[PDB]
Amino acid sequence: SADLEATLRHKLTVMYSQINGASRALDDVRNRQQDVRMTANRKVEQLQQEYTEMKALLDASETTSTRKIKEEEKRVNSQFDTIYQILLKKKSEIQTLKEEIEQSLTKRDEFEFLEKASKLRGISTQPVYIPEVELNHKLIKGIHQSTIDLKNELKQCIGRLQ
Amino acid sequence: ASADLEATLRHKLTVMYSQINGASRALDDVRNRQQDVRMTANRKVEQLQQEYTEMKALLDASETTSTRKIKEEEKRVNSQFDTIYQILLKKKSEIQTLKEEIEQSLTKRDEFEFLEKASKLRGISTQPVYIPEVELNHKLIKGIHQSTIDLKNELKQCIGRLQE
């Protein structure tokens, strides 16, 4: 009769323990869930680094190429600077001989002219000669294409990994 | 005599005067070839620059497209745990309820009340709950992580030879 009530009392006690078992288990799951979140982020942060480091490498080759192009630009515009120099001289010197020859025929009838005149006939001049210079187009093309040949091979790697 | 000389000079002067303009035209010519050289260089930098921008867009996809794949798995697994939590909470509740019921019932002291509360307790499991093991798929993740390294290295090696 009253055995039933006392069984219930004891059961109550066991229940209390089951509840905690459940509460431990619930906390346990919430914690395995965080661990999982941590390990994910970890691996994302890891793969994020690769790409950063990839970008550093691309950024070098880009700069290193750019410079190679600019070095050529500079190479060539230097040659022209040297040609410019040479041409200005040619101009001013020819200018001087014009000025000489002209002011010589100022005084055509002095006896001294026939002497000065024949001297100036020996002083001949000639046009200015731009030599052929240009940007090395094979070198540049070579690069431009070649950086494409990278893009495409980077594309094809992103292929097989993904 | 002096007839011929002066006339030679006249002709010379006009050869010269014209060569002076040749020289000024030649000077303008080089300044213009220099701009052209500047324009063509810049073009080619600006073009080289675009490749790399486009390269970066491609790297930026794969990166995000991989990241998602990892996050999708995270979600996959935390969903399984959500389902386990659900199972466990429902257990806790059924028990906690029946404790509260049985408890306030001992106020009243009806041995039928008891028989009933006894039969309710027979329909509640007495065993632990079975947490199965849920794991992030490690092959899938390693697979990626290493594989993005396998990219870095092959991108490095392209940049090598495609730069010497």
Curated annotation (Swiss-Prot), chain A:
Organ and tissue specificity: Expressed in breast tumors (at protein level). Ubiquitous.
Main localization category: cytoplasm
Entry keywords, A to Z: Acetylation, Antiviral defense, Coiled coil, Cytoplasm, Host-virus interaction, Immunity, Innate immunity, Isopeptide bond, Ligase, Metal-binding, Nucleus, Phosphoprotein, Transferase, Ubl conjugation, Ubl conjugation pathway, Zinc, Zinc-finger
Metal-binding found in the keyword field: yes
Top-level taxon: Eukaryota
Induction context: By interferons.
PTM: Auto-ISGylated. (Microbial infection) Autoubiquitinated; promoted by Epstein-Barr virus protein BPLF1.
GO BP terms, alphabetized: antiviral innate immune response; cellular response to leukemia inhibitory factor; cytoplasmic pattern recognition receptor signaling pathway; ERAD pathway; host-mediated suppression of symbiont invasion; innate immune response; positive regulation of canonical NF-kappaB signal transduction; positive regulation of DNA-binding transcription factor activity
Post-translational modification Phosphotyrosine, affected residues: 84
Modified residues (N6-acetyllysine): 79
UniProt GO cellular component terms: cytoplasm; cytoplasmic stress granule; cytosol; nuclear body; nucleoplasm
Record's subcellular location: Cytoplasm; Cytoplasm, Stress granule; Nucleus
Protease keyword on record: no
GO molecular function, a single term: cadherin binding
Coiled coil: 23-113
Self-association and partners: Forms homodimers. Interacts (via SPRY domain) with RIGI (via CARD domain). Interacts with ZFHX3. Interacts with NLRP12; this interaction reduces the E3 ubiquitin ligase TRIM25-mediated 'Lys-63'-linked RIGI activation. Interacts with the KHDC3L/FILIA-OOEP/FLOPED scaffold complex and BLM at DNA replication forks. Interacts with RTN3; this interaction prevents RIGI ubiquitination. Interacts with YWHAE. (Microbial infection) Interacts (via coiled coil) with influenza A virus NS1 protein; this interaction specifically inhibits TRIM25 multimerization and TRIM25-mediated RIGI CARD ubiquitination, thereby suppressing RIGI signal transduction.
Domain notes from UniProt: The RING-type zinc finger is important for ISG15 E3 ligase activity and autoISGylation. AutoISGylation negatively regulates ISG15 E3 ligase activity. The C-terminal B30.2/SPRY domain interacts with the first N-terminal CARD domain of RIGI.
Biological function: Functions as a ubiquitin E3 ligase and as an ISG15 E3 ligase. Involved in innate immune defense against viruses by mediating ubiquitination of RIGI and IFIH1. Mediates 'Lys-63'-linked polyubiquitination of the RIGI N-terminal CARD-like region and may play a role in signal transduction that leads to the production of interferons in response to viral infection. Mediates 'Lys-63'-linked polyubiquitination of IFIH1. Promotes ISGylation of 14-3-3 sigma (SFN), an adapter protein implicated in the regulation of a large spectrum signaling pathway. Mediates estrogen action in various target organs.
Descriptive protein name: E3 ubiquitin/ISG15 ligase TRIM25
Organism expressing this protein natively: Homo sapiens
Residues of the full protein shown: 195 to 356 of 630
